[PDB]
Amino acid sequence: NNIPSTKSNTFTGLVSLKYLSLSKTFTSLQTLTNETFVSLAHSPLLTLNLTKNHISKIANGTFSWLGQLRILDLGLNEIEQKLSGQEWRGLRNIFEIYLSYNKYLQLSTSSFALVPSLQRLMLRRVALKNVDISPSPFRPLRNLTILDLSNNNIANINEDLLEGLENLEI
RNA sequence: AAAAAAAAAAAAAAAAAAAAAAAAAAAAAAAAAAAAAAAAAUUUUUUUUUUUUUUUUUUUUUUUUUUUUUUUUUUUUUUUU
Ligand SMILES: *[C@@H]1O[C@H](CO)[C@@H](O[C@@H]2O[C@H](CO)[C@@H](O[C@@H]3O[C@H](CO)[C@@H](O)[C@H](O)[C@@H]3O)[C@H](O)[C@H]2NC(C)=O)[C@H](O)[C@H]1NC(C)=O
Ligand SMILES: *[C@@H]1O[C@H](CO)[C@@H](O[C@@H]2O[C@H](CO)[C@@H](O[C@@H]3O[C@H](CO)[C@@H](O)[C@H](O)[C@@H]3O)[C@H](O)[C@H]2NC(C)=O)[C@H](O)[C@H]1NC(C)=O
Ligand SMILES: *[C@@H]1O[C@H](CO)[C@@H](O[C@@H]2O[C@H](CO)[C@@H](O[C@@H]3O[C@H](CO)[C@@H](O)[C@H](O)[C@@H]3O)[C@H](O)[C@H]2NC(C)=O)[C@H](O)[C@H]1NC(C)=O
Ligand SMILES: *[C@@H]1O[C@H](CO)[C@@H](O[C@@H]2O[C@H](CO)[C@@H](O)[C@H](O)[C@H]2NC(C)=O)[C@H](O)[C@H]1NC(C)=O
């Protein structure tokens, strides 16, 4: 679809919505703030698709109202930002992360400490850099089961990386 | 009482020529020093500009194989309008 962007009360009234797909829907969503998904405050969403939406920047607390959100898809986008952890603020019980197929995703020591209840995490084709800092960004995470960092040209990995990820299987 | 010649002692003052010394200043010659400086012969750091080797990401191009559709020119054959 070709909707420019959402409004304050676009999705207001959906008190039972749990499956939402917005793939290749928004063309004027270059920058994401915390006033986009405000309409879904009362929606117990479980799946969220946002691929091919030309997402390039998200603000702190954008998904704060998505407390019950478990599945999110931000792949196939043009994200150009520095991860700090506050981008995933408000995710009380999140299941997995879809941020593959990007061009720049810089990781920090606290980029993922806010949400430690993940299950899967793949960063395929994101060109991530500077993951040599200690402690590792994945240290707080405990229930990761699938971890993919392929097609990103990892410069270096140290001993502190992949520490304590006992639950990992793939 | 006083004045003078030969012979002998002389005490003081003003000058000088020498010897033995001693402080003071000024000249040099050697042993050191503290330095603000100067190079030269051995180690190496940081930064800028660039060379070579090696491992990989993105994009583009060539070829081969497989496969889905828009068009088809053929129809060996089958009942026919
Ligand atoms: C959505 O994103 C905007 C943009 O970052 C957030 O606005 C920012 O909010 C912080 C926190 O309040 C502000 O920092 C501090 O604000 C207080 C006033 O509350 C002020 O006294 C401090 O000096 C400091 O500035 C920040 O200025 C503000 N920035 C902008 C551009 O608005 C907003 O809070 C976010 N909302 C949610 C729900 O996440
Ligand atoms: C948002 O919607 C899109 C479109 O429906 C979903 O894309 C689909 O994603 C799945 C899983 O990534 C794809 O399945 C896999 O496809 C690859 C080829 O890309 C194949 O090699 C695998 O064996 C597997 O079949 C699926 O093809 C793909 N469909 C389309 C039309 O792109 C996307 O998953 C949705 N995001 C969600 C649900 O979070
Ligand atoms: C969204 O949240 C992140 C994480 O809280 C914010 O990043 C944080 O920004 C502050 C203010 O710049 C940083 O504090 C200072 O950082 C400098 C280094 O940039 C450091 O030298 C100072 O001593 C001080 O700590 C904080 O470190 C930084 N945190 C992280 C994890 O990056 C970001 O500003 C927020 N953005 C918005 C729009 O609200
Ligand atoms: C990490 O995974 C474990 C195992 O799935 C989680 O423990 C479960 O937590 C739920 C909800 O709190 C309980 O209903 C289950 O009974 C727990 N299972 C076990 C075997 O203990 C744990 O909560 C996860 N960690 C985080 C931070 O979410």
Short mmCIF file of C-alpha atoms (C1' of nucleotides) and ligand atoms in Angstrom, two decimals:
data_model
loop_
_atom_site.label_atom_id
_atom_site.label_comp_id
_atom_site.label_asym_id
_atom_site.label_seq_id
_atom_site.Cartn_x
_atom_site.Cartn_y
_atom_site.Cartn_z
CA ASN A 1 0.00 0.00 0.00
CA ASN A 2 0.95 3.67 -0.31
CA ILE A 3 -0.22 5.32 2.91
CA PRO A 4 2.18 8.20 3.73
CA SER A 5 2.16 7.71 7.50
CA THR A 6 -0.11 6.89 10.42
CA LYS A 7 -1.93 9.49 12.51
CA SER A 8 -2.69 9.92 16.21
CA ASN A 9 -5.90 7.84 16.19
CA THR A 10 -5.59 5.79 13.00
CA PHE A 11 -5.76 2.40 14.75
CA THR A 12 -7.74 3.62 17.78
CA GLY A 13 -10.67 1.33 18.59
CA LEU A 14 -8.99 -2.05 17.95
CA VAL A 15 -9.07 -3.50 21.46
CA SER A 16 -8.60 -7.12 20.31
CA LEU A 17 -6.10 -6.77 17.45
CA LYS A 18 -3.23 -9.26 17.64
CA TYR A 19 -2.04 -9.80 14.03
CA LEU A 20 -1.03 -6.66 12.11
CA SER A 21 0.85 -6.59 8.80
CA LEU A 22 2.20 -3.35 7.32
CA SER A 23 4.75 -4.62 4.79
CA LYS A 24 5.52 -2.18 1.95
CA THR A 25 2.72 0.06 3.22
CA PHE A 26 4.32 3.37 4.25
CA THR A 27 6.41 5.54 1.93
CA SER A 28 6.80 8.67 4.11
CA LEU A 29 7.93 6.81 7.25
CA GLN A 30 11.62 7.67 6.87
CA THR A 31 11.89 8.70 10.54
CA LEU A 32 10.00 6.92 13.32
CA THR A 33 9.00 8.69 16.54
CA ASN A 34 7.08 7.54 19.62
CA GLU A 35 3.85 9.09 18.29
CA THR A 36 3.24 6.58 15.48
CA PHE A 37 2.03 3.45 17.32
CA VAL A 38 0.19 5.40 20.04
CA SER A 39 -3.12 4.22 18.54
CA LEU A 40 -2.20 0.60 19.37
CA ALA A 41 -1.91 1.23 23.13
CA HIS A 42 -4.97 -0.90 23.92
CA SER A 43 -4.35 -3.43 21.12
CA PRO A 44 -2.85 -6.73 22.41
CA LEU A 45 -0.70 -7.13 19.31
CA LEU A 46 1.35 -10.30 18.90
CA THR A 47 2.75 -10.08 15.33
CA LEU A 48 3.94 -6.92 13.57
CA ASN A 49 5.19 -6.73 9.97
CA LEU A 50 6.98 -3.58 8.80
CA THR A 51 9.22 -4.78 5.96
CA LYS A 52 9.90 -2.63 2.89
CA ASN A 53 8.61 0.47 4.71
CA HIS A 54 11.83 2.47 4.15
CA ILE A 55 12.41 2.77 7.90
CA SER A 56 15.66 4.65 8.52
CA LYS A 57 15.46 6.05 12.08
CA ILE A 58 13.42 5.19 15.17
CA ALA A 59 13.17 7.25 18.35
CA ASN A 60 13.44 6.23 21.99
CA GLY A 61 10.32 4.57 23.36
CA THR A 62 8.72 4.11 19.94
CA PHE A 63 7.31 0.70 20.92
CA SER A 64 6.61 1.59 24.56
CA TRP A 65 2.87 1.02 24.14
CA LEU A 66 3.60 -2.37 22.51
CA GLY A 67 3.86 -4.07 25.88
CA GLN A 68 2.22 -7.32 24.74
CA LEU A 69 3.99 -7.36 21.35
CA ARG A 70 5.89 -10.59 20.71
CA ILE A 71 6.67 -10.68 16.96
CA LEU A 72 8.10 -7.66 15.13
CA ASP A 73 9.53 -7.48 11.61
CA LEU A 74 11.71 -4.52 10.62
CA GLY A 75 13.74 -6.30 7.94
CA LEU A 76 14.42 -5.17 4.38
CA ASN A 77 14.73 -1.55 5.52
CA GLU A 78 17.26 1.30 5.40
CA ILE A 79 17.90 1.77 9.12
CA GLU A 80 20.69 4.28 9.81
CA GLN A 81 20.97 4.71 13.58
CA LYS A 82 22.97 3.80 16.68
CA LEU A 83 21.41 1.17 18.94
CA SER A 84 21.29 2.14 22.61
CA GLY A 85 18.68 -0.17 24.16
CA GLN A 86 16.00 2.47 24.62
CA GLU A 87 14.74 1.78 21.09
CA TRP A 88 13.11 -1.39 22.48
CA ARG A 89 11.65 0.33 25.55
CA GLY A 90 8.26 -0.97 26.67
CA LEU A 91 8.67 -4.52 25.33
CA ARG A 92 7.53 -6.43 28.41
CA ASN A 93 7.43 -9.89 26.77
CA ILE A 94 9.12 -9.97 23.35
CA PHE A 95 9.82 -13.22 21.50
CA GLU A 96 12.23 -12.51 18.62
CA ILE A 97 13.75 -9.64 16.64
CA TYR A 98 13.70 -9.13 12.86
CA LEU A 99 16.36 -6.54 11.93
CA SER A 100 18.05 -8.28 9.02
CA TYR A 101 18.77 -6.81 5.57
CA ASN A 102 20.07 -3.38 6.57
CA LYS A 103 23.12 -1.21 5.85
CA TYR A 104 24.33 0.04 9.26
CA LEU A 105 23.48 -1.27 12.74
CA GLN A 106 26.02 -0.20 15.36
CA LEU A 107 25.93 -2.20 18.61
CA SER A 108 26.73 -0.97 22.11
CA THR A 109 27.14 -2.61 25.51
CA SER A 110 23.57 -1.60 26.48
CA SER A 111 21.83 -1.90 23.10
CA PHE A 112 19.92 -5.02 24.22
CA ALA A 113 20.03 -5.03 28.05
CA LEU A 114 16.52 -3.54 28.29
CA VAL A 115 14.84 -6.73 27.04
CA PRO A 116 16.51 -9.97 28.28
CA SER A 117 13.64 -12.34 27.34
CA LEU A 118 14.44 -12.91 23.65
CA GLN A 119 14.35 -16.25 21.85
CA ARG A 120 15.70 -15.60 18.33
CA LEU A 121 17.94 -12.86 16.95
CA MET A 122 19.32 -12.65 13.40
CA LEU A 123 21.25 -9.73 11.92
CA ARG A 124 21.80 -11.02 8.39
CA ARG A 125 23.20 -8.40 5.99
CA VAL A 126 23.25 -5.41 8.35
CA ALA A 127 26.96 -4.45 8.22
CA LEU A 128 27.36 -4.16 11.98
CA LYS A 129 30.61 -2.71 13.30
CA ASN A 130 32.45 -2.28 16.61
CA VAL A 131 31.33 -5.34 18.56
CA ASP A 132 34.71 -5.76 20.31
CA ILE A 133 33.67 -3.77 23.39
CA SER A 134 33.40 -5.47 26.78
CA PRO A 135 31.05 -6.60 28.15
CA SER A 136 29.44 -8.19 25.09
CA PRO A 137 26.06 -6.71 24.06
CA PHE A 138 24.51 -10.20 24.26
CA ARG A 139 25.70 -10.79 27.84
CA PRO A 140 22.41 -9.76 29.56
CA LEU A 141 20.42 -11.99 27.20
CA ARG A 142 19.62 -15.45 28.51
CA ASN A 143 16.99 -17.37 26.47
CA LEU A 144 18.38 -16.77 22.99
CA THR A 145 17.96 -19.96 20.98
CA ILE A 146 18.82 -18.85 17.43
CA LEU A 147 21.62 -16.34 16.87
CA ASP A 148 22.62 -15.32 13.34
CA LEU A 149 25.23 -12.71 12.43
CA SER A 150 25.94 -13.88 8.89
CA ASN A 151 26.81 -11.82 5.80
CA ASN A 152 28.01 -8.87 7.90
CA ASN A 153 31.84 -9.07 7.64
CA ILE A 154 32.59 -9.31 11.36
CA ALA A 155 35.90 -7.55 11.90
CA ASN A 156 36.81 -9.14 15.25
CA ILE A 157 35.37 -11.22 18.09
CA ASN A 158 36.94 -11.53 21.53
CA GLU A 159 36.57 -13.99 24.41
CA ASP A 160 33.87 -11.90 26.12
CA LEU A 161 31.52 -12.39 23.15
CA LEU A 162 28.91 -15.16 23.39
CA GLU A 163 29.32 -15.38 27.17
CA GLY A 164 26.55 -16.96 29.22
CA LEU A 165 24.33 -17.78 26.22
CA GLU A 166 23.69 -21.30 27.48
CA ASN A 167 20.21 -21.57 25.92
CA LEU A 168 21.57 -20.98 22.39
CA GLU A 169 21.04 -23.86 19.96
CA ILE A 170 21.36 -22.43 16.43
"C1'" A B 1 129.11 84.79 81.94
"C1'" A B 2 130.08 84.28 76.36
"C1'" A B 3 132.30 82.79 71.45
"C1'" A B 4 134.83 79.46 68.61
"C1'" A B 5 138.80 74.86 66.12
"C1'" A B 6 140.62 69.43 66.55
"C1'" A B 7 138.66 64.29 69.47
"C1'" A B 8 134.42 61.60 71.31
"C1'" A B 9 129.41 60.18 72.40
"C1'" A B 10 124.92 60.91 70.86
"C1'" A B 11 118.76 61.59 71.24
"C1'" A B 12 114.62 63.84 68.04
"C1'" A B 13 112.55 65.53 63.24
"C1'" A B 14 112.50 65.80 57.63
"C1'" A B 15 114.02 62.92 53.69
"C1'" A B 16 115.89 58.81 50.85
"C1'" A B 17 118.46 53.90 48.53
"C1'" A B 18 118.14 48.57 49.76
"C1'" A B 19 117.02 43.26 52.08
"C1'" A B 20 113.33 39.71 54.77
"C1'" A B 21 108.17 39.48 54.73
"C1'" A B 22 102.65 40.11 54.84
"C1'" A B 23 97.97 41.14 53.56
"C1'" A B 24 94.71 43.61 49.08
"C1'" A B 25 93.61 44.75 43.82
"C1'" A B 26 94.72 43.53 38.73
"C1'" A B 27 96.98 39.94 34.88
"C1'" A B 28 97.64 35.42 32.87
"C1'" A B 29 98.53 29.31 32.78
"C1'" A B 30 96.56 24.54 34.50
"C1'" A B 31 92.64 21.10 37.55
"C1'" A B 32 87.77 21.09 38.35
"C1'" A B 33 82.09 22.53 38.61
"C1'" A B 34 76.71 24.31 37.77
"C1'" A B 35 74.16 25.38 33.82
"C1'" A B 36 70.94 28.09 29.31
"C1'" A B 37 73.01 25.89 24.18
"C1'" A B 38 75.29 22.91 19.91
"C1'" A B 39 75.92 18.97 16.99
"C1'" A B 40 76.45 12.90 15.84
"C1'" A B 41 75.71 7.51 16.53
"C1'" U B 42 72.57 3.90 18.49
"C1'" U B 43 67.52 2.74 20.01
"C1'" U B 44 62.74 3.37 19.26
"C1'" U B 45 57.10 6.02 19.97
"C1'" U B 46 52.73 9.26 18.06
"C1'" U B 47 50.66 11.53 13.64
"C1'" U B 48 49.98 12.58 8.20
"C1'" U B 49 50.52 10.90 3.06
"C1'" U B 50 51.02 6.60 0.22
"C1'" U B 51 53.21 1.01 -1.72
"C1'" U B 52 52.77 -4.48 -1.57
"C1'" U B 53 50.59 -9.28 0.28
"C1'" U B 54 46.40 -11.82 2.31
"C1'" U B 55 40.98 -12.64 4.16
"C1'" U B 56 36.17 -11.15 3.31
"C1'" U B 57 31.08 -7.41 2.37
"C1'" U B 58 28.26 -4.55 -1.46
"C1'" U B 59 27.44 -3.50 -6.67
"C1'" U B 60 28.12 -4.76 -11.83
"C1'" U B 61 29.33 -8.21 -15.97
"C1'" U B 62 30.12 -13.28 -18.61
"C1'" U B 63 28.93 -18.44 -19.04
"C1'" U B 64 26.38 -23.15 -17.59
"C1'" U B 65 22.22 -25.79 -15.31
"C1'" U B 66 17.17 -25.84 -13.36
"C1'" U B 67 12.35 -23.63 -13.22
"C1'" U B 68 7.55 -20.16 -13.64
"C1'" U B 69 4.79 -17.10 -17.13
"C1'" U B 70 3.27 -13.46 -22.13
"C1'" U B 71 3.62 -15.06 -27.21
"C1'" U B 72 3.93 -18.75 -30.34
"C1'" U B 73 5.18 -21.36 -35.91
"C1'" U B 74 4.17 -27.57 -35.91
"C1'" U B 75 0.88 -31.07 -34.97
"C1'" U B 76 1.92 -37.63 -35.95
"C1'" U B 77 -3.28 -38.83 -33.56
"C1'" U B 78 -8.93 -38.17 -31.56
"C1'" U B 79 -14.32 -37.06 -31.96
"C1'" U B 80 -16.30 -32.87 -35.48
"C1'" U B 81 -19.32 -27.53 -37.21
C1 LIG C 1 9.43 10.62 22.46
O1 LIG C 1 10.65 11.13 21.92
C2 LIG C 1 10.90 12.50 22.26
C3 LIG C 1 12.17 12.90 21.54
O2 LIG C 1 13.32 12.36 22.17
C4 LIG C 1 11.01 12.65 23.78
O3 LIG C 1 11.16 14.02 24.10
C5 LIG C 1 12.27 14.19 25.00
O4 LIG C 1 11.92 13.80 26.33
C6 LIG C 1 13.00 13.90 27.27
C7 LIG C 1 12.48 13.35 28.58
O5 LIG C 1 11.46 14.18 29.12
C8 LIG C 1 13.48 15.35 27.36
O6 LIG C 1 14.62 15.40 28.20
C9 LIG C 1 14.38 16.17 29.41
O7 LIG C 1 13.04 16.69 29.45
C10 LIG C 1 12.74 17.36 30.68
C11 LIG C 1 11.27 17.71 30.69
O8 LIG C 1 10.53 16.52 30.92
C12 LIG C 1 13.65 18.60 30.79
O9 LIG C 1 13.41 19.26 32.02
C13 LIG C 1 15.13 18.19 30.71
O10 LIG C 1 15.97 19.34 30.74
C14 LIG C 1 15.41 17.33 29.47
O11 LIG C 1 15.28 18.18 28.34
C15 LIG C 1 13.84 15.88 25.98
O12 LIG C 1 14.14 17.27 26.06
C16 LIG C 1 12.70 15.65 24.99
N1 LIG C 1 13.09 16.08 23.66
C17 LIG C 1 12.22 16.47 22.73
C18 LIG C 1 12.80 16.87 21.40
O13 LIG C 1 11.01 16.51 22.94
C19 LIG C 1 9.77 12.09 24.46
O14 LIG C 1 9.94 12.09 25.87
C20 LIG C 1 9.50 10.66 23.99
N2 LIG C 1 8.27 10.15 24.58
C21 LIG C 1 8.14 8.89 25.01
C22 LIG C 1 6.81 8.53 25.59
O15 LIG C 1 9.05 8.07 24.92
C1 LIG C 2 5.89 -10.00 6.36
O1 LIG C 2 5.26 -10.37 5.13
C2 LIG C 2 6.17 -10.96 4.19
C3 LIG C 2 5.37 -11.22 2.93
O2 LIG C 2 4.30 -12.12 3.17
C4 LIG C 2 6.80 -12.23 4.77
O3 LIG C 2 7.78 -12.69 3.84
C5 LIG C 2 7.93 -14.12 3.87
O4 LIG C 2 8.96 -14.48 4.80
C6 LIG C 2 9.17 -15.90 4.92
C7 LIG C 2 10.21 -16.09 6.00
O5 LIG C 2 11.24 -15.11 5.91
C8 LIG C 2 9.60 -16.47 3.57
O6 LIG C 2 9.76 -17.88 3.67
C9 LIG C 2 11.11 -18.22 3.28
O7 LIG C 2 11.44 -17.63 2.02
C10 LIG C 2 12.78 -17.89 1.60
C11 LIG C 2 13.05 -17.08 0.35
O8 LIG C 2 13.03 -15.70 0.69
C12 LIG C 2 12.93 -19.41 1.38
O9 LIG C 2 14.26 -19.70 0.98
C13 LIG C 2 12.60 -20.16 2.68
O10 LIG C 2 12.68 -21.56 2.47
C14 LIG C 2 11.23 -19.76 3.23
O11 LIG C 2 10.26 -20.31 2.35
C15 LIG C 2 8.55 -16.13 2.51
O12 LIG C 2 8.99 -16.57 1.23
C16 LIG C 2 8.28 -14.63 2.48
N1 LIG C 2 7.23 -14.32 1.53
C17 LIG C 2 7.27 -13.27 0.71
C18 LIG C 2 6.09 -13.11 -0.21
O13 LIG C 2 8.21 -12.49 0.70
C19 LIG C 2 7.45 -11.94 6.12
O14 LIG C 2 7.89 -13.14 6.74
C20 LIG C 2 6.45 -11.24 7.04
N2 LIG C 2 7.08 -10.92 8.31
C21 LIG C 2 6.72 -11.48 9.47
C22 LIG C 2 5.62 -12.49 9.40
O15 LIG C 2 7.26 -11.19 10.53
C1 LIG C 3 17.89 7.37 23.82
O1 LIG C 3 18.45 6.63 24.91
C2 LIG C 3 19.88 6.54 24.87
C3 LIG C 3 20.29 5.65 26.02
O2 LIG C 3 19.85 6.17 27.27
C4 LIG C 3 20.49 7.93 24.95
O3 LIG C 3 21.91 7.84 24.85
C5 LIG C 3 22.50 8.47 26.01
O4 LIG C 3 22.70 9.87 25.79
C6 LIG C 3 23.26 10.55 26.92
C7 LIG C 3 23.32 12.02 26.57
O5 LIG C 3 24.24 12.27 25.52
C8 LIG C 3 24.63 9.97 27.26
O6 LIG C 3 25.14 10.60 28.43
C9 LIG C 3 26.47 11.11 28.17
O7 LIG C 3 27.11 10.40 27.12
C10 LIG C 3 28.42 10.88 26.80
C11 LIG C 3 28.91 10.15 25.56
O8 LIG C 3 28.08 10.52 24.47
C12 LIG C 3 29.32 10.65 28.02
O9 LIG C 3 30.63 11.13 27.74
C13 LIG C 3 28.74 11.40 29.24
O10 LIG C 3 29.55 11.15 30.38
C14 LIG C 3 27.28 11.01 29.49
O11 LIG C 3 27.28 9.68 29.98
C15 LIG C 3 24.52 8.47 27.49
O12 LIG C 3 25.81 7.90 27.68
C16 LIG C 3 23.84 7.79 26.30
N1 LIG C 3 23.67 6.37 26.54
C17 LIG C 3 23.85 5.44 25.60
C18 LIG C 3 23.63 4.02 26.03
O13 LIG C 3 24.18 5.73 24.46
C19 LIG C 3 19.95 8.80 23.82
O14 LIG C 3 20.43 10.14 23.96
C20 LIG C 3 18.42 8.81 23.84
N2 LIG C 3 17.90 9.57 22.72
C21 LIG C 3 16.78 10.30 22.79
C22 LIG C 3 16.39 11.02 21.54
O15 LIG C 3 16.11 10.36 23.82
C1 LIG C 4 13.88 -17.71 30.19
O1 LIG C 4 13.27 -18.99 29.92
C2 LIG C 4 12.70 -19.68 31.04
C3 LIG C 4 12.19 -21.01 30.53
O2 LIG C 4 11.23 -20.84 29.50
C4 LIG C 4 11.61 -18.80 31.66
O3 LIG C 4 11.05 -19.48 32.78
C5 LIG C 4 9.63 -19.63 32.59
O4 LIG C 4 8.94 -18.42 32.90
C6 LIG C 4 7.52 -18.49 32.69
C7 LIG C 4 6.97 -17.10 32.91
O5 LIG C 4 7.71 -16.40 33.90
C8 LIG C 4 6.92 -19.54 33.62
O6 LIG C 4 5.53 -19.64 33.37
C9 LIG C 4 7.59 -20.88 33.37
O7 LIG C 4 7.13 -21.83 34.33
C10 LIG C 4 9.12 -20.76 33.48
N1 LIG C 4 9.76 -22.02 33.14
C11 LIG C 4 10.76 -22.56 33.85
C12 LIG C 4 11.29 -23.86 33.34
O8 LIG C 4 11.21 -22.01 34.85
C13 LIG C 4 12.22 -17.48 32.09
O9 LIG C 4 11.22 -16.62 32.65
C14 LIG C 4 12.87 -16.78 30.89
N2 LIG C 4 13.51 -15.55 31.32
C15 LIG C 4 12.96 -14.34 31.16
C16 LIG C 4 13.76 -13.18 31.66
O10 LIG C 4 11.86 -14.20 30.64
#
